[PDB]
Design a protein around this ligand. Structure first.
Ligand SMILES: N[C@@H](CCC(=O)N[C@@H](CS)C(=O)NCC(=O)O)C(=O)O
Lengths: 298, 314
């Protein structure tokens, strides 16, 4: 498996086409997508709700891609209030009728220019971290998920976490031969062993504080036991019974911070993967287990 | 032959899986068509198959290894059903030493060319008449338990996996263990609608809870001794973490992490009794299920986990 890179790459900035203003931007997401979920977590952590709206698609990705709730009603899914789109593809096609890539989420939309600002989760969360600091209340303005002295270590972990873990699980799950499957899953678990020892005495990956590296990791790890273990055959061992440090870390984040918990919808997560990926799971059946979705704090 | 052959099959339209009964149901009796003799009967099995594994376990427990030969098929059960090793080489798999069969189906079609059922292992074969005696694991293990007793050494002859005082309980336990556990995992795994899956997987785990309680303080399901109830249970449990959890979506919890008594009970049998360990081939087990059931697993990928296949004793 090879991930086709994102094609809308503009930034929100004081001095550009896309300036930081209240009620100008809008974020289209699925609760199921860990990429999109990065942007939801950071959006809450930075208290950006008044500047940035959110529309949640249905988790059931049929042949037309991600549907809006008026096409496919599902608990906690929304209709598109802006462009009245039926599927995420309409957003893309409206602004670029010749667009040749995947119709992905997250989509960061500009309500003023009627265009897509950025559809790359790593950039959305980066801009979310600073671009609105001047308009936000104190504590929210001060929060820095990418602080200067840690940017080197963050960039480092981000790159290999992205490669072997965030994308690793999908490389494992989408591989169509035994050899490609094994070539992906072994590094995945090697990297987990590494993260596991990194967290031996810590509550955060890097620097004793919350960073965007924890956010990027969390979205994968929280989906691991409920989905990746079975759905993507990433099953050498599990988080809850295989990785005490990762398990503690993930649970602290989940239970202790509404930004990680309120943006985490397990029904959307399990429905999306199991029901949509018929090339892996032909009858679209959603396993009941494991129970529970996530364990309480120790 | 493909329709009753290639496991790319059909369920009931409500989604549920309805197992067809085995149709070769004869017994080894003192003067029947099939009398007990050393060197007359042969057993065709896969190591993957829990039903067939029942017969392999009892065969060792009862000291029947010198009496009844065994031929192990390849676990890769393709469009022609189970193959012999000359058709599909696989470590520890055999070619047919008796009838030059390509696939297990050739055994069935030789004796009944109009056979319409499934070509299942185990097959208990009679070398003298060249027919199938019995293809029901539950009956094979019964007859193995008693029918050769007059021919065995005292230690083997005296072993009784179905003793008089425990029979009614064995039968009761066997009945709902078969329905909700042994065949329960298959009902869960093979279900083709969400509803049918849930109707099977929930009672499965209710029965494990029940089994977990029975095994509190106990080393055996019944009567404080090894019986056929353990053997019948063990073949499902030992396959649970390595296969059923992911392949059959029996993942509410695992044995190693969710059921301490079952976990203990299984490791003891496996580690403490060579009949259970020497008949357990995990490579065959995982390859068979994952590679064969393309209607569940289209790319035939066999997961590396969980590691290990079975944990050491404490
Ligand atoms: N009632 C039989 C069931 C045996 C059985 O269905 N074995 C399976 C292996 S899981 C088999 O040979 N399947 C071949 C097929 O169904 O095509 C018994 O207990 O012996």
């Amino acid at each position: 498996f090879k991930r086709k890179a994102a094609s809308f790459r503009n930034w929100i900035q004081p001095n550009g086409d896309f300036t930081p203003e209240k009620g100008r931007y809008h974020l289209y997401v699925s609760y199921a997508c860990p990429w999109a979920t990065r942007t939801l977590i950071v959006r809450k952590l930075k208290g950006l709700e008044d500047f940035i709206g959110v529309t949640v698609v249905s988790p059931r990705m049929g042949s037309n891609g991600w549907p809006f709730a008026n096409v496919d009603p599902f608990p906690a899914a929304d209709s598109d209030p802006l462009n009245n789109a039926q599927h995420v593809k309409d957003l893309y096609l409206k602004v670029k009728p010749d667009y040749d890539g995947r119709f992905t989420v997250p989509v960061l939309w500009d309500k003023h220019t009627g265009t897509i600002v950025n559809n790359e989760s790593s950039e959305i969360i980066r801009m979310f971290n600073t671009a609105f600091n001047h308009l936000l209340p104190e504590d929210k303005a001060k929060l820095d998920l990418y602080p200067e002295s840690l940017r080197a270590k963050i960039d480092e972990v981000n790159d290999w976490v992205y490669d072997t873990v965030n994308n690793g699980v999908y490389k494992s799950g989408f591989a169509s031969t035994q050899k490609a499957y094994e070539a992906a899953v072994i590094p995945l678990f090697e990297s987990l062993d590494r993260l596991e020892k990194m967290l031996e005495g810590q509550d955060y990956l890097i620097g004793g504080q919350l960073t965007e590296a924890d956010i990027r990791l969390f979205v994968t790890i929280v989906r691991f036991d409920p989905v990746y273990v079975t759905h993507f055959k990433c099953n050498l061992r599990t988080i809850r019974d295989g990785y005490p440090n990762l398990h503690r870390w993930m649970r602290k984040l989940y239970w202790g911070n509404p930004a990680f918990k309120d943006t985490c919808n397990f029904e959307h997560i399990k429905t999306h993967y199991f029901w949509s990926h018929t090339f892996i799971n032909p009858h679209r059946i959603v396993p009941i287990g494991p129970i529970p979705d996530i364990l309480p704090l120790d």
